[PDB]
């Protein structure tokens, strides 16, 4: 029973007569040593993705990597709750979030010209002067203009079955038709998508019965 993992003395298990233990999947969890009979636990070695915190190459070319969900006592080395990060220095301050990392930790590029990893701050502290007989009334206003951009329709498209799967080959088209109607059921969906792509624009813009014109 070959494989890989970390062997560990497991006195918790009993196995009075059982040779091996196993889990929900077909993966062994406990075995007994054939030479001397004790129960050993098998735990897989740690693993995880790698992420690269980096400012734009326009600014500089300094990076700091992060192994998430890795207790890197084995691997300036830091240690966070979302993994462990090497290449940036811890800072006791707190600013807005520039490059999110996780678990309330954010990274940013200072100046020193180094990379820092801090705990994000939600906003500037404020406290209203509330009182049971006090009011605040505005004396002046301001007019503001805001932009809001949102998409309406995507690009209509359509594909051909034989021309793509079996381009210019008669013996390929002579084997493709053995599968029945796997072609029309795709073109139908694509046609429906293309139709709704025009319905969207018609709904969004065509809301005037007549075309008005401004005075000269």
């Amino acid at each position: 029973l070959t494989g890989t993992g970390v062997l560990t003395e497991s006195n918790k298990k009993f196995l009075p007569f059982q040779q091996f233990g196993r889990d929900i999947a077909d993966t062994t969890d406990a075995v007994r040593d054939p030479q001397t009979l004790e129960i050993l636990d098998i735990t897989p070695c740690s693993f995880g993705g790698v992420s690269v915190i980096t400012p734009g190459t326009n600014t500089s070319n300094q990076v700091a990597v992060l192994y998430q969900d890795v207790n890197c006592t084995e691997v300036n080395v830091f240690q966070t709750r979302a993994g462990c990060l090497i290449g940036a220095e811890h800072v006791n301050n707190s600013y807005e979030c520039d490059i999110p990392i996780g678990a309330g930790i954010c990274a940013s590029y200072q100046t020193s010209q180094s990379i820092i990893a801090y705990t994000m701050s939600l906003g500037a502290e404020n406290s209203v002067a509330y009182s049971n007989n006090s009011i605040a009334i505005p004396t002046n206003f301001t007019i503001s203009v805001t932009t809001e951009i949102l998409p309406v329709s995507m690009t209509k498209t359509s594909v051909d079955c034989t021309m793509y799967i079996c381009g210019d080959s008669t013996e390929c088209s002579n084997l493709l038709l053995q599968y029945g109607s796997f072609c029309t059921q795709l073109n139908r969906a694509l046609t429906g998508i293309a139709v709704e792509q025009d319905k969207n624009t018609q709904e969004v813009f065509a809301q005037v019965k007549q075309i008005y014109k401004t005075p000269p």
Partner: protein, 198 residues
């Protein structure tokens, strides 16, 4: 970088099409990625086997692309419905829904077209400079209790005025700005001052 929302749709569509086209350069377990090579080098009995595995791979790729396109189209329709609602409400009228047609008090909006999208220019009203005063729920005049018809009672330290809630504009208290409701031994926090009568 203001138009990232519209650029993302184009980027994803181009990436999906590029991936679909590039999927034709894979063996899927066959000897060669071009069926012409197979049909010109091997006899039918296993040439068809390789052709069959190529067909299965390409059909699976097409199915995946179609499913992704369907999901993206559903999301785009979901966004277009909101765009149509905004056009119907914020533009063709005035909306009282808070934070729906821009931060602040909505006044009117202007639509502009854009590649595969729309852009709104919301015009809003925002108070700027504030002050401090001292209010009172009501006022006794002759044992009665006068409440504001519309607005609040404010005091600058010595005198009392009635003013609208969204703009400082003091006025003398009178019987045309207030209405009477019973005696004033029930209201909490009532302070009594003279009320002018025209």
């Amino acid at each position: 970088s203001a138009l990232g929302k519209l650029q993302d749709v184009v980027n994803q569509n181009a990436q999906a099409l590029n991936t679909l086209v590039k999927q034709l350069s894979s063996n899927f377990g066959a000897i060669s990625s071009v069926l012409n090579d197979i049909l010109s080098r091997l006899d039918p009995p296993e040439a068809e086997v390789q052709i069959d595995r190529l067909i299965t791979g390409r059909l699976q790729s097409l199915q995946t692309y179609v499913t992704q396109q369907l999901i993206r189209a559903a999301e785009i329709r979901a966004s277009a419905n909101l765009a149509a609602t905004k056009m119907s409400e914020c533009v063709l009228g005035q909306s009282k829904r808070v934070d729906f047609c821009g931060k602040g008090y909505h006044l009117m909006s202007f639509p502009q077209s854009a590649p595969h999208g729309v852009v709104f220019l919301h015009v809003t009203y925002v108070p700027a400079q504030e002050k401090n005063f001292t209010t009172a729920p009501a006022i006794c005049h002759d044992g009665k209790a006068h409440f504001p018809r519309e607005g609040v009672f404010v005091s600058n330290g010595t005198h009392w005025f009635v003013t609208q809630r969204n703009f400082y504009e003091p006025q003398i208290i009178t019987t045309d700005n207030t209405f009477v409701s019973g005696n004033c031994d029930v209201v909490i926090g009532i302070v009594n001052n003279t009320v002018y009568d025209p």
